[PDB]
Amino acid sequence: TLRAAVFDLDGVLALPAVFGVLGRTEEALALPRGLLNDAFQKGGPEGATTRLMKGEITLSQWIPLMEENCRKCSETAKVCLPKNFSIKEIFDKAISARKINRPMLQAALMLRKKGFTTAILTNTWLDDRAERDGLAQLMCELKMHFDFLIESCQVGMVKPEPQIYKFLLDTLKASPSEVVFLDDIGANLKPARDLGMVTILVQDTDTALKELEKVTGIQLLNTPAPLPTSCNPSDMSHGYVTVKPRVRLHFVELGSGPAVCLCHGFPESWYSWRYQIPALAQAGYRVLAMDMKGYGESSAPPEIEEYCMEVLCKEMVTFLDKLGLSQAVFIGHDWGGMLVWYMALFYPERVRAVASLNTPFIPANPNMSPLESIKANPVFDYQLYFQEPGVAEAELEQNLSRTFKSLFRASDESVLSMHKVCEAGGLFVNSPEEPSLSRMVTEEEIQFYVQQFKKSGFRGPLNWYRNMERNWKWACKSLGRKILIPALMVTAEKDFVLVPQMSQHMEDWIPHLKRGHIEDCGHWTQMDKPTEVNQILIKWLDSDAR
Amino acid sequence: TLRAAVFDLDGVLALPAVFGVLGRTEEALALPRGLLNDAFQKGGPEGATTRLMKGEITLSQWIPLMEENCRKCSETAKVCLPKNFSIKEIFDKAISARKINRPMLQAALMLRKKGFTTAILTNTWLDDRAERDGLAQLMCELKMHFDFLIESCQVGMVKPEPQIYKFLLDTLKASPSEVVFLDDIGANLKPARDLGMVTILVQDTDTALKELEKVTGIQLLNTPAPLPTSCNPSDMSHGYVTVKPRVRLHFVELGSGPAVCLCHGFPESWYSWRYQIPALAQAGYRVLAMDMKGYGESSAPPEIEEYCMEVLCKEMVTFLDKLGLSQAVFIGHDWGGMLVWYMALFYPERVRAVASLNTPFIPANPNMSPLESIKANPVFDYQLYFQEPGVAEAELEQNLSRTFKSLFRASDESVLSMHKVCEAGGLFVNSPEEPSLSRMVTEEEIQFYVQQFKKSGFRGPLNWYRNMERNWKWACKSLGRKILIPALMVTAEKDFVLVPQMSQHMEDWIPHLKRGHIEDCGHWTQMDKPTEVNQILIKWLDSDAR
Ligand SMILES: Cc1n[nH]cc1-c1ccccc1
Ligand SMILES: Cc1n[nH]cc1-c1ccccc1
Ligand SMILES: Cc1n[nH]cc1-c1ccccc1
Ligand SMILES: Cc1n[nH]cc1-c1ccccc1
Ligand SMILES: Cc1n[nH]cc1-c1ccccc1
Ligand SMILES: Cc1n[nH]cc1-c1ccccc1
* SS3 of residue A313 by DSSP: helix
Ordered DSSP codes for B117-183: EEEEEE------STTTHHHHHHHHHHHTTSSEEEEHHHHT--TTSHHHHHHHHHHHT--GGGEEEEE
Q: How many angstroms separate the CA atoms of A442 and A438, rounded?
A: 8
Active-site residue, B342 included: no
Ligand with the closest atom to the CA of B428: 5
Residues in a beta bridge with A489: A356, A515
Of B139, B235, B484, the CB nearest to A322: B235
List chain B residues with CB under 8 Å of A240: 237-240
When scoring B237, B297, B319, B485 by the number of chain A Cβ atoms within 10 A, the one with the most, hence best to mutate, is: B237
Whether A178 and A302 map to the same domain: the answer is no
CA of A263 to the centre of ligand 5 (A): 47
Inter-CA distances, A511 with A328, A505, B55, B56, B334, Å? 21, 10, 20, 18, 57
Question: With a 6 A CB cut-off, is A497 part of the ligand 2 pocket?
Answer: yes
Q: Parallel, antiparallel, or unpaired: how do β-strands A247-254 and A237-244 relate?
A: antiparallel
* SS3 of residue A332 by DSSP: strand
Whether B192 and B256 map to the same domain: the answer is no
DSSP B45: G
Report yes or no: B12 and B125 within 8 Å, Cβ to Cβ.
no
Q: How many angstroms separate the CA atoms of A171 and A154, rounded?
A: 14
Q: How many angstroms separate the CA atoms of A176 and A157, rounded?
A: 19
Whether A300 and A440 map to the same domain: the answer is yes
Active-site residue, B334 included: yes
Q: How many angstroms separate the CA atoms of A523 and A410, rounded?
A: 8
Considering Cα of B75, then B79, then B85, then B90, what sign does the dihedral take?
negative
Ligand with the closest atom to the CA of A265: 1
A528 annotated ligand-binding residue: no
Q: Give backbone dihedrals phi and psi of A210, rounded to 5 degrees, phi first.
A: -65, -45
For residue B56, what is the domain's CATH number? 1.10.150.240
Of B156, B237, B321, the CB nearest to A140: B321
The angle at the Cα of A221, spanning A218 to A222, to the nearest 5 degrees, equals 120
Question: With a 6 A CB cut-off, is A468 part of the ligand 3 pocket?
Answer: yes
Ordered DSSP codes for B473-513: HHHHTTTT----S-EEEEEETT-SSS-GGGGTTGGGT-TT-
Q: How many angstroms separate the CA atoms of B248 and B319, rounded?
A: 9
For residue B541, what is the domain's CATH number? 3.40.50.1820
Q: CB within 6 Å of ligand 1 — which residues?
A: A 334-335, 338, 359, 380, 498
* SS3 of residue A113 by DSSP: helix
Indicate which residues of A carry an active-site annotation.
Answer: 334, 465, 523
CA dihedral of residues B317, B323, B329, B331 (deg, nearest 10): -70
| Burial zone of A205 (CB within 10 Å; 0-12 exposed, 13-18 middle, 19+ buried) | middle
Question: With a 6 A CB cut-off, is B335 part of the ligand 4 pocket?
Answer: yes
Whether A198 and A289 map to the same domain: the answer is no
- Which helix (H) or strand (E) segment holds residue A51: the answer is helix A48-53
Q: What is the 3-state secondary structure (H, E, C) of B344-361?
A: HHHCHHHEEEEEEECCCC
Asked if the structure places residue B230 within a domain, the reply is no
In 3D space, the residue among A153, A208, A215 whose CA is nearest the CA of residue A178 turns out to be: A215
Ligand with the closest atom to the CA of B440: 5
Q: How many angstroms separate the CA atoms of B195 and B187, rounded?
A: 14
Report yes or no: B277 and B144 within 8 Å, Cβ to Cβ.
no
CA of A499 to the centre of ligand 2 (A): 11
Q: How many angstroms separate the CA atoms of B397 and A50, rounded?
A: 50
Asked if the structure places residue A271 within a domain, the reply is yes
Give the distance from residue B183's alpha carbon to the nearest chain A alpha carbon, in angstroms.
24
Q: How many angstroms separate the CA atoms of A172 and A264, rounded?
A: 40
All residues at 6 or more sequence positions from A50 whose CB lies less than 8 Å from its CB, including other chains: A43, A44, A158
DSSP B228: P
Encode B91-121: b = buried (16+ Cβ within 10 Å), e = exposed.
Answer: bbebbeebeebeebbbbbbbbeeeebbbbbb
Report yes or no: A427 and A537 within 8 Å, Cβ to Cβ.
no
CA dihedral of residues B37, B43, B44, B50 (deg, nearest 10): -90
List chain A residues with CB under 8 Å of B478: 55
Number of domain units in chain B: 3
* SS3 of residue A120 by DSSP: strand
Report yes or no: B87 and B81 within 8 Å, Cβ to Cβ.
no
Q: Report the interhelical angle of A186-195 vs A162-172 (nearest 10°).
A: 60
Asked if the structure places residue A224 within a domain, the reply is no
Task: Name the region of A115 (left: φ>0; alpha: ψ -120 to 50; beta: rest).
Answer: left
Question: With a 6 A CB cut-off, is A165 part of the ligand 3 pocket?
Answer: no
All residues at 6 or more sequence positions from B69 whose CB lies less than 8 Å from its CB, including other chains: B39, B40, B42, B47, B48
Q: B486: cis peptide before it, omega within 30°?
A: no
Ligand with the closest atom to the CA of A471: 3
Catalytic residue among B307, B465, B495, B528: B465
* SS3 of residue A140 by DSSP: helix
Q: Parallel, antiparallel, or unpaired: how do β-strands B99-100 and B14-15 relate?
A: antiparallel
List chain A residues with CB under 8 Å of B287: 324
Nearest-atom index, ligand 1, CA of A468: 9
Across the interface, whether the CB atoms of A237 and B56 are under 8 A apart is answered no
CA dihedral of residues B312, B313, B318, B320 (deg, nearest 10): 120
Asked if the structure places residue A50 within a domain, the reply is yes
Q: How many angstroms separate the CA atoms of B237 and B493, rounded?
A: 34
Q: How many angstroms separate the CA atoms of B468 and B375, rounded?
A: 12
Q: How many angstroms separate the CA atoms of B269 and B455, rounded?
A: 13
In 3D space, the residue among B411, B447, B444 whose CA is nearest the CA of residue B524 turns out to be: B411
Of B327, B478, B484, the CB nearest to A128: B484
Across the interface, whether the CB atoms of A477 and B254 are under 8 A apart is answered no
- Which helix (H) or strand (E) segment holds residue A139: the answer is helix A133-143
List chain B residues with CB under 8 Å of A256: 259, 286, 324-326
Across the interface, whether the CB atoms of B61 and A346 are under 8 A apart is answered no
* SS3 of residue B91 by DSSP: helix
- Closest alpha carbon within chain A to B314: A154
CA of A492 to the centre of ligand 2 (A): 13
Across the interface, whether the CB atoms of A240 and B235 are under 8 A apart is answered no
Type of residue numbered B61: Q
When scoring B241, B253, B256, B509 by the number of chain A Cβ atoms within 10 A, the one with the most, hence best to mutate, is: B256
Tell me which residue range forms the domain holding A211.
Answer: 1-16+97-217
HSE-CB at B17 with a 13 A cutoff on CA atoms is: 17
Secondary structure percentages of chain B, helix, strand, coil, to 5: 45, 15, 40
When scoring B154, B349, B354 by the number of chain A Cβ atoms within 10 A, the one with the most, hence best to mutate, is: B349
Whether B110 and B183 map to the same domain: the answer is yes
Asked if the structure places residue A223 within a domain, the reply is no
Residues in a beta bridge with B331: B262, B355
Type of residue numbered A341: W
B381 annotated ligand-binding residue: no
In this structure, which residue's CA is closest to atom 9 in ligand 6? B471
Of B240, B255, B481, the CB nearest to A57: B481
Asked if the structure places residue A225 within a domain, the reply is no
Asked if the structure places residue A81 within a domain, the reply is yes
List chain B residues with CB under 8 Å of A546: none
The angle at the Cα of B74, spanning B73 to B77, to the nearest 5 degrees, equals 85
Q: How many angstroms separate the CA atoms of B272 and B277, rounded?
A: 10
Give the distance from residue A296's alpha carbon to the nearest chain B alpha carbon, in angstroms.
16
Q: Parallel, antiparallel, or unpaired: how do β-strands B328-333 and B286-290 relate?
A: unpaired
In 3D space, the residue among A60, A220, A54, A72 whose CA is nearest the CA of residue A130 turns out to be: A60
Residues in a beta bridge with A241: A249
Q: Give backbone dihedrals phi and psi of B289, rounded to 5 degrees, phi first.
A: -95, 110
Residues in a beta bridge with A472: none
Q: How many angstroms separate the CA atoms of A67 and A314, rounded?
A: 61
Whether B371 and B345 map to the same domain: the answer is yes
- The full length of chain B comes to 546
Report yes or no: B247 and B315 within 8 Å, Cβ to Cβ.
yes
CA dihedral of residues B409, B411, B413, B417 (deg, nearest 10): 90
Give the distance from residue B140's alpha carbon to the nearest chain A alpha carbon, in angstroms.
6
Domain C-terminal end among B96, B124, B146: B96
Mutational pocket test of ligand 4: of B268, B309, B334, the residue with most ligand atoms within 8 Å of the beta carbon: B334
List chain A residues with CB under 8 Å of B253: 239, 323
* Helices (H), ranges, B301-398: 309-323, 335-346, 370-376, 381-385, 391-397
Ordered DSSP codes for B423-474: HHTSTTTT--SSPPPPTT--HHHHHHHHHHHHHHTTHHHHHTTS-HHHHHHH
All residues at 6 or more sequence positions from A522 whose CB lies less than 8 Å from its CB, including other chains: A409, A410, A411, A492, A494, A495, A528
Domain C-terminal end among A217, A246, A262: A217
Asked if the structure places residue A70 within a domain, the reply is yes
Q: How many angstroms separate the CA atoms of A252 and A285, rounded?
A: 13
Whether B328 and B455 map to the same domain: the answer is yes
Reported resolution in A?
Answer: 1.8
Whether B378 and B304 map to the same domain: the answer is yes
Mutational pocket test of ligand 5: of B497, B521, B526, the residue with most ligand atoms within 8 Å of the beta carbon: B497
Q: What is the 3-state secondary structure (H, E, C) of A75-105?
A: HHCCCCCCCCCCHHHHHHHHHHHCEECHHHH
Whether B206 and B71 map to the same domain: the answer is no
Domain C-terminal end among A96, A112, A128: A96
Across the interface, whether the CB atoms of B136 and A350 are under 8 A apart is answered yes
Give the distance from residue B184's alpha carbon to the nearest chain A alpha carbon, in angstroms.
25
Whether A74 and A146 map to the same domain: the answer is no
Whether A125 and A54 map to the same domain: the answer is no
Give the distance from residue B208's alpha carbon to the nearest chain A alpha carbon, in angstroms.
29
Across the interface, whether the CB atoms of B140 and A326 are under 8 A apart is answered yes
List chain A residues with CB under 8 Å of B135: 349
Q: How many angstroms separate the CA atoms of B258 and B306, rounded?
A: 29
- Provide the greatest CA pair distance for chain A: 95
Give the distance from residue A413's alpha carbon to the nearest chain B alpha carbon, in angstroms.
36
Whether A126 and A8 map to the same domain: the answer is yes
Across the interface, whether the CB atoms of B239 and A237 are under 8 A apart is answered yes
For residue B9, what is the domain's CATH number? 3.40.50.1000
CA of B266 to the centre of ligand 6 (A): 16
- For residue A529, how far is the Cα from the chain centroid? 14
Q: How many angstroms separate the CA atoms of B81 and A248, rounded?
A: 54
Mutational pocket test of ligand 2: of A407, A427, A495, the residue with most ligand atoms within 8 Å of the beta carbon: A407
* SS3 of residue A137 by DSSP: helix
A8 annotated ligand-binding residue: yes
